[PDB]
Amino acid sequence: MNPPPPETSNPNKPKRQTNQLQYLLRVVLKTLWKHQFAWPFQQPVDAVKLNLPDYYKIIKTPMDMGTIKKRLENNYYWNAQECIQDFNTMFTNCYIYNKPGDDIVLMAEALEKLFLQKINELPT
């Protein structure tokens, strides 16, 4: 019941390694990765393990930090804005599928606060 995960490698994609993208991996993602609440978001939602066959009926553009990490490590992105959009997709998916006050939403909200603080200032 799980869809194939989002692509992390694509040679036809134009790739770039900007200072901002290096920082998004070295600083932003690796800070969030060690957060006490990161673990649900370190890999795609496994709807089979969670017994949530409804998850991928609702969420049609899944995203997670494990995919984001592999993309950054594959220099998959052209600019930091594309990577930030992936983070935002991951958070928005969680708020769409769940309801305010749910434990998973509190974890996402905490990660997002940290995320917004870390990207408030990026390199030039």
Interface positions with ligand 8F9 (CB under 6 A)? 40-41, 45, 50, 52, 55, 94, 97-98, 103-104
Report the distance separating Cα 23 and Cα 20, nearest Å: 5
**Shorter beta-carbon distance to ligand 8F9: residue 73 or 103:** 103
∠ CA 12-29-39, rounded to 5°: 110
Q: What is the closest distance, in whole angstroms, from the C-beta atom of residue 93 to ligand 8F9 in the complex?
A: 6
Least CB distance from residue 102 to ligand 8F9, whole Å? 7
Neighbours of 24 (CB within 10 A): 24
Shortest Cβ distance from residue 7 to ligand 8F9 (Å)?
19
